[PDB]
Amino acid sequence: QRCGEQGSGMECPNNLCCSQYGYCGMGGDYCGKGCQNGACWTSKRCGSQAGGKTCPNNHCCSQYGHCGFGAEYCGAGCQGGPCRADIKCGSQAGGKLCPNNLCCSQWGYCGLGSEFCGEGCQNGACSTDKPCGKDAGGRVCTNNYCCSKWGSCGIGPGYCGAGCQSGGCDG
Amino acid sequence: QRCGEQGSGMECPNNLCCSQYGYCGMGGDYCGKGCQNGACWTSKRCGSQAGGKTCPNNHCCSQYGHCGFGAEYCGAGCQGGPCRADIKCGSQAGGKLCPNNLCCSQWGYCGLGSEFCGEGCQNGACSTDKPCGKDAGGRVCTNNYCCSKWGSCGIGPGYCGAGCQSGGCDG
Ligand SMILES: CC(=O)N[C@@H]1[C@@H](O)[C@H](O[C@@H]2O[C@H](CO)[C@@H](O)[C@H](O)[C@H]2NC(C)=O)[C@@H](CO)O[C@H]1O
Ligand SMILES: CC(=O)N[C@@H]1[C@@H](O)[C@H](O[C@@H]2O[C@H](CO)[C@@H](O)[C@H](O)[C@H]2NC(C)=O)[C@@H](CO)O[C@H]1O
Q: Which residue among B66, B69, B78 is best mutated to probe the pocket of ligand 2, counting the most ligand atoms within 8 A of its Cβ?
C-alpha cells in the first residue's frame, strides 16, 4: 500500500505519483515537490547523465536523460525503457543483458511475453525455469538471480536465503 | 510493501512479479500462477480481447490482447501501453483521453514529460494546475479527477474527501 522509500521501491498503478511520504495519487500534493516515482512533475534523470538511474514505471529515458513517454522520449536517443528501436542483447552483444528484468529472445532482442521469455531466452525474466546448481552441472543463473536450494533461479527469501547455492544469496 | 490485491494495486520495481500473496520477486513463486503484475510468466490479457483492460507496469497490449514488451507488443496492433506509434488524443481526437493518466500534449499526442504535461496539456497528469471549482468559473478537471477545496485537481483523500468541488469525490 505504501510506495517509494516507504513502500520498498513499490510503484503506483496507472502512473500515479508517489508523493514524498510514500502515498499514491494525482495532484501537486503527490506529483510536485517530493515525488518518488510515477508521473512526477519534474521528470527524473537517467542513464548516461545519471549513471544508470533507470526510469521507474517502465518509462523511457530520453537522449538527454529525463523520464517520460512520447516520441521525444521513447523515440530517438532513447537510452532505456520501452524504446521504439529494438534493443539487442545476448550472445549477439558479447553476452549483454536486458535492462529492468527484460527477457532476451533467442533472436537477441529484449521484450516481455512468450516470444521473448519463452524458449531460447538468454537472460531476464525467462519463464523456461532452467535449474541451476549442484544437480545441474553447476549452472549459475543469469542477472545474478539467486539459485535456490531446489536449483531454481529467482529473487526473494525463498531463493536468496536458506541454501542459496549461487547468485545474490543472503548469507 | 505489498503488491497486487494485498497492497492496493501496487506494482513491484524493475519488472519483478507480484505473487498471489502480495509479495515481489522473480521465480515461479512470484512469476508463475498467482502472479498479479510484473513479469508474469502468463501475460495478463487486455484491450478489446479483455473488456478494455490496461496492462500493469505500463506494458504494451499487443493486437492479440496480451501484455509485454518488444516489437510484437509495442509495434503494430499495439492497442495500449507505451505504444510505438504516437498515441493521439484531445480536441483533435474527439476528446479522447490518454490512457494510464498520460498527458495529452497540445499537439494531440499522449506522452509524459515537460513536452506533453507542461503548458498546453489537454488531459492526464498535466504539471499545470489550472484552477477548478468556483475558484475559477467552476472549471472541471479532466480524467474525472477531484477538484479539492483549494480548487486544484488531483487524486487522494486530500482532493476527493472533504471539500471536493466536483470529480470522483468521496464524501
Ligand atoms: C539546459 C537544458 O534545458 N537543456 C535542454 C535539455 O534539458 C532538454 O531536454 C528536456 O529538458 C527539460 C529540462 O529543462 C526536461 O524537463 C525535459 O523532460 C527534457 N526533455 C527530454 C526529451 O529529455 C533538451 C530537449 O528539449 O534541450 C536542451 O536544450
Ligand atoms: C486468437 C489467437 O489465438 N491469436 C493468436 C495469438 O494468441 C498469438 O499471440 C500470442 O499468443 C500467445 C498465447 O497463445 C502469447 O503468449 C503471446 O504473447 C501472444 N503474442 C502477442 C503478440 O500477443 C499469435 C502468435 O504469437 O498467433 C495468433 O494467431
A: B66
